[PDB]
Amino acid sequence: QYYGTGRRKSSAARVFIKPGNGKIVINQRSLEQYFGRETARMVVRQPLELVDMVEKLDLYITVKGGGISGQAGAIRHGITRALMEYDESLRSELRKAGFVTRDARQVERKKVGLRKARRRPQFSKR
Amino acid sequence: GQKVHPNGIRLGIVKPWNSTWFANTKEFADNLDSDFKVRQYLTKELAKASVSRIVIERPAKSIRVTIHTARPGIVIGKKGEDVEKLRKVVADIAGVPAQINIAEVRKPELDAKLVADSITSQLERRVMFRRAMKRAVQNAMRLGAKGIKVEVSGRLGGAEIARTEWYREGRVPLHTLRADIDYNTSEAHTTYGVIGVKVWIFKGEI
Amino acid sequence: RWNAVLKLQTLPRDSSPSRQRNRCRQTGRPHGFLRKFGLSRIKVREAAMRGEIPGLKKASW
Amino acid sequence: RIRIRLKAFDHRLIDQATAEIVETAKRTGAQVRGPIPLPTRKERFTVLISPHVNKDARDQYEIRTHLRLVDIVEPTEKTVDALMRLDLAAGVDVQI
RNA sequence: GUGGUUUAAUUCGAUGCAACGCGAAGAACCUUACCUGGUCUUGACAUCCACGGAAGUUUUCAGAGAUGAGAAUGUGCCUUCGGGAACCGUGAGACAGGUGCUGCAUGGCUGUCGUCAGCUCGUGUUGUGAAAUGUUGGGUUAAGUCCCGCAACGAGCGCAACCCUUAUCCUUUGUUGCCAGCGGUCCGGCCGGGAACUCAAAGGAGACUGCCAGUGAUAACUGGAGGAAGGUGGGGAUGACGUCAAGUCAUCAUGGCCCUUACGACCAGGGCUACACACGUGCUACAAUGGCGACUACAAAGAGAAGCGACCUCGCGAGAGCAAGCGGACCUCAUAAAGUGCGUCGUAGUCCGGAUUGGAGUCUGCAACUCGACUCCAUGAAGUCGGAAUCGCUAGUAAUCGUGGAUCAGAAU
């Protein structure tokens, strides 16, 4: 068995990789069940495709906090890093995609003086 | 343009508050108004004494009030007569039985709040400020310190056009939020007009 | 009014002394009065701002 | 086995009281499970800094309600005598 | 909101950018500073003196109110019984007050060109002098950033650095967390139980062009590996010598000037939301990658004492009556919306769009006929996307959707 923390935005998804059929369990619920009708759901298992696993691995996931979208990215990271433990050599190929990198973007307070907290209000054709 | 109040900009760091007491959502207003009303008299009746500061602490129904003066003798009065007068007259302001203290200040030259008064006092009279500042800055510099700076605006020397005398020694980093620079500000009534007196005393980095 | 303010009459009708109510002293409103001052919610405010009410002060935030 | 949760608005007056509660119980009784922070529920306000225009300002404010645990086990007669008698902090609400 | 027009008054200031939801972070009386009419006083506010009753409470008569008249409980307190402290009321004296004018007389604070990037000093040297040199020149940089050269050598304000929030990790700690692990389970962490994980809090660790290749005199630039993040990683506070004689004397303080039966005070009653038009700033629009009904799945940050209001009952509903719990990361505001599953609607001014108007009702408030918001029924317009110009932006950002909060009894699109 192997483990992966995985984090994105405001969500944590522990990934416990285990050799098996290829079914994953998200909070005691099937992958499709939890992520029901959310095209993005697919990206969650992307890291497993690169190194070609899934049909060889069975995963047990535990996610909490944030939203389904964020959880999807969190579980992804957890899977990528978990794959590393199984075989470090996977890094050389799994890293090129950037799956080992955690998206640091965080919904920052929409500061004022600007409309986007970052983006400032320009001026008319002076 | 102005520069962030040195004292107010370093309150989070080396620079305690004038009044420290527990929270109180509904009493915060009254207590403060009381702390301000007590300062009112301590800022006048305690003038001739070099009132550097007036710390304030408040238990349930009490207050300490520690007036730091350069010459506590004038505050205490003849064999301790004035202090009795104060505590009483102050009680009239707020029934709450208040305490009182008279912690002296070792060498006023290090106290900014006082350096300002000494400078304005001479100006109120009528003396070449260029000398006042030059001396004042030298005094605090003489008594030690690592830096000092004095500034007087208004119509210096009774001149028609307003000016701003400078002068300073050592280091007075207002940006270095750590320097712990004791600030001050003393007004100055005059026949020709008002004039502000600002003095900075940098003592130790930490 | 002058007729409703029968409260002024110390001796209540057939009803026991409990009949005696309140009524404001200024406006004479029975709706919302303040026992301590004997004034209604509307008069206590007007009297407050005027400062005619001793010891009373507006709470601040 | 007595747990003492100390909560208050000011962060300092708590460290003072909480520390005292420990030090005093450190002698007569056990060494205490040690004073700890615990989760602090925060209440923040976002009002306009400047009264006019500068709509794009409104600073942030916050009023925190800190907590503590301490928790003193193996209480002796003197272990409590050192508590009931001395009590300074006023902005601190004790819960034994 | 404003101009104009208007009015008994519809207070005043602000005006190209740096006037126009502008001071008013909230005008129903109050606030207001306006108008008609009735009416007063040491007086709405400050200090003090002399003086016969004097603290204080509750009623009556008259009245539109104000006001006037009048009647009844009755003093502790410092000292002996007289004096006497206090506040209070009348009579009398000495006096206050003014958002009334001038911010080109001003302090303070703030806006602006500007976060724009440079601006200067001490001493030396050159010139009769105003000044120059140093801040010029070559390379380089986002930058007087840095390097090299040079009578210049150093220094100050600025830059950078010093603090906080956010991104990865660790240590300390856990009544939040979770069978992650085991046991029980009304299978709700719920319980036992344990701190791993998330989280909470504090401290600490961490990038510095160091390593590799190319170019270069150097600085440095370009590519690359390692790496959670890299070349100031990302967001705050902070705004130089000075400018416009910028704004405010209605925040406050202040020099001069000006009024003190009245440019003071009280009360009753009237407007600012008056229109043939003109302008600025905004809002709501036209669908089926849509609207509607039922069912159903996830959020964060916030608020609550007479207040948030579960639950029950009455009403189509607003709401009303009753009423539990919390004082609150354990009770409530809450339902999150879009989303998902199922069903319904056909291109016509239409189940598009909601103006306007009629009727009924709820709620706040002393009291909503010019001046309310909201609910239900009925009515249901213009509009089928727009003539000349012109405005907003480079990433979780645009665009789009919904939610909580400050001010606050209540017009925030």
Side-chain angles (χ1 to χ4, degrees), chain B residues 53-74:
Chain B
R53 69 173 74 173
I54 54 290
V55 184
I56 295 179
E57 295 181 297
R58 289 173 166 293
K61 53 177 175 298
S62 178
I63 206 298
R64 296 179 176 61
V65 177
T66 60
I67 186 287
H68 290 285
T69 173
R71 54 187 302 179
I74 181 63

Side-chain angles (χ1 to χ4, degrees), chain B residues 129-197:
Chain B
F129 172 63
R130 181 175 298 303
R131 300 176 60 277
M133 49 169 235
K134 189 171 298 179
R135 294 298 180 179
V137 177
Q138 178 57 61
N139 286 58
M141 188 67 262
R142 176 81 69 175
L143 185 63
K146 301 175 63 181
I148 176 181
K149 177 170 59 183
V150 179
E151 179 180 60
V152 148
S153 184
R155 296 169 55 182
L156 178 56
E160 299 181 60
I161 181 176
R163 294 179 59 276
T164 58
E165 218 66 296
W166 201 55
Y167 196 70
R168 55 167 276 291
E169 296 183 59
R171 286 174 49 272
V172 186
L174 309 182
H175 304 58
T176 60
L177 194 166
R178 58 166 184 173
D180 175 60
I181 304 176
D182 187 54
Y183 183 62
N184 63 61
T185 300
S186 60
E187 199 71 299
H189 67 300
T190 308
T191 303
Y192 55 63
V194 183
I195 171 280
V197 182

Side-chain angles (χ1 to χ4, degrees), chain A residues 52-67:
Chain A
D52 299 300
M53 302 301 256
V54 292
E55 182 181 301
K56 175 187 177 182
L57 293 59
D58 187 301
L59 318 184
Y60 180 64
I61 311 302
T62 299
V63 63
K64 63 292 181 60

Side-chain angles (χ1 to χ4, degrees), chain A residues 81-93:
Chain A
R81 57 195 301 172
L83 297 174
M84 301 173 88
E85 301 187 303
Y86 176 61
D87 190 302
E88 62 172 59
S89 301
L90 297 179
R91 298 179 180 180
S92 301
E93 180 181 300

Side-chain angles (χ1 to χ4, degrees), chain D residues 53-94:
Chain D
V53 189
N54 189 182
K55 304 310 214 67
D56 295 300
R58 310 200 252 182
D59 185 58
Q60 172 69 299
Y61 290 115
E62 192 184 329
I63 178 283
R64 304 160 184 174
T65 302
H66 305 298
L67 300 72
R68 302 297 175 183
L69 185 68
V70 181
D71 190 301
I72 306 175
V73 298
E74 301 176 59
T76 306
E77 293 189 301
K78 178 175 294 300
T79 301
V80 301
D81 298 305
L83 299 176
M84 287 61 262
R85 297 201 74 282
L86 298 180
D87 296 300
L88 297 65
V92 182
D93 299 300
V94 300

Side-chain angles (χ1 to χ4, degrees), chain B:
Chain B
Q2 289 185 55
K3 176 63 179 181
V4 60
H5 194 63
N7 297 180
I9 186 62
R10 59 166 52 69
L11 289 177
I13 58 95
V14 185
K15 191 62 180 180
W17 286 262
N18 299 300
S19 298
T20 174
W21 36 286
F22 55 70
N24 50 321
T25 303
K26 57 71 182 299
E27 197 68 60
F28 196 62
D30 302 300
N31 286 38
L32 289 177
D33 180 59
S34 181
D35 300 304
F36 285 119
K37 184 170 296 182
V38 298
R39 291 191 178 72
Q40 301 176 179
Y41 288 111
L42 296 178
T43 303
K44 291 182 174 59
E45 299 300 63
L46 289 299
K48 280 59 182 179
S50 301
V51 53
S52 300
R53 69 173 74 173
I54 54 290
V55 184
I56 295 179
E57 295 181 297
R58 289 173 166 293
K61 53 177 175 298
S62 178
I63 206 298
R64 296 179 176 61
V65 177
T66 60
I67 186 287
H68 290 285
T69 173
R71 54 187 302 179
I74 181 63
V75 181
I76 300 179
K78 308 184 75 298
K79 64 165 60 183
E81 180 287 300
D82 185 59
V83 290
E84 182 180 61
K85 174 66 68 179
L86 301 176
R87 182 179 300 180
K88 179 178 296 182
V89 300
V90 176
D92 296 59
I93 298 303
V96 178
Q99 189 71 302
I100 189 64
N101 299 298
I102 56 291
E104 63 175 59
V105 178
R106 214 210 72 175
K107 286 60 183 178
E109 298 178 57
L110 291 178
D111 291 55
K113 300 299 297 299
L114 305 183
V115 180
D117 298 304
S118 61
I119 296 177
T120 175
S121 296
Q122 300 187 300
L123 184 57
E124 298 182 304
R125 304 172 183 177
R126 54 186 61 278
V127 63
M128 300 175 84
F129 172 63
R130 181 175 298 303
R131 300 176 60 277
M133 49 169 235
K134 189 171 298 179
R135 294 298 180 179
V137 177
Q138 178 57 61
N139 286 58
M141 188 67 262
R142 176 81 69 175
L143 185 63
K146 301 175 63 181
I148 176 181
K149 177 170 59 183
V150 179
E151 179 180 60
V152 148
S153 184
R155 296 169 55 182
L156 178 56
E160 299 181 60
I161 181 176
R163 294 179 59 276
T164 58
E165 218 66 296
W166 201 55
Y167 196 70
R168 55 167 276 291
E169 296 183 59
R171 286 174 49 272
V172 186
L174 309 182
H175 304 58
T176 60
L177 194 166
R178 58 166 184 173
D180 175 60
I181 304 176
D182 187 54
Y183 183 62
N184 63 61
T185 300
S186 60
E187 199 71 299
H189 67 300
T190 308
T191 303
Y192 55 63
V194 183
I195 171 280
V197 182
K198 302 180 181 61
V199 182
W200 317 71
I201 299 181
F202 172 58
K203 195 67 181 63
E205 191 66 61
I206 304 72

Side-chain angles (χ1 to χ4, degrees), chain D:
Chain D
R1 298 179 177 297
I2 301 178
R3 179 178 287 81
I4 306 75
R5 176 185 294 184
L6 302 178
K7 63 177 64 61
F9 300 117
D10 184 298
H11 175 290
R12 289 303 304 175
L13 53 63
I14 298 180
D15 305 301
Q16 301 179 179
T18 303
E20 183 290 300
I21 301 300
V22 181
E23 301 179 300
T24 184
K26 296 291 284 61
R27 311 183 187 67
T28 172
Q31 300 178 177
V32 183
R33 303 184 76 282
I36 53 176
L38 286 302
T40 301
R41 182 181 185 295
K42 40 69 179 181
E43 167 173 56
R44 305 187 185 186
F45 295 69
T46 46
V47 308
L48 315 76
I49 302 175
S50 61
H52 181 37
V53 189
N54 189 182
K55 304 310 214 67
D56 295 300
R58 310 200 252 182
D59 185 58
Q60 172 69 299
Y61 290 115
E62 192 184 329
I63 178 283
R64 304 160 184 174
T65 302
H66 305 298
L67 300 72
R68 302 297 175 183
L69 185 68
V70 181
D71 190 301
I72 306 175
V73 298
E74 301 176 59
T76 306
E77 293 189 301
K78 178 175 294 300
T79 301
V80 301
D81 298 305
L83 299 176
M84 287 61 262
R85 297 201 74 282
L86 298 180
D87 296 300
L88 297 65
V92 182
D93 299 300
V94 300
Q95 180 183 300
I96 47 74

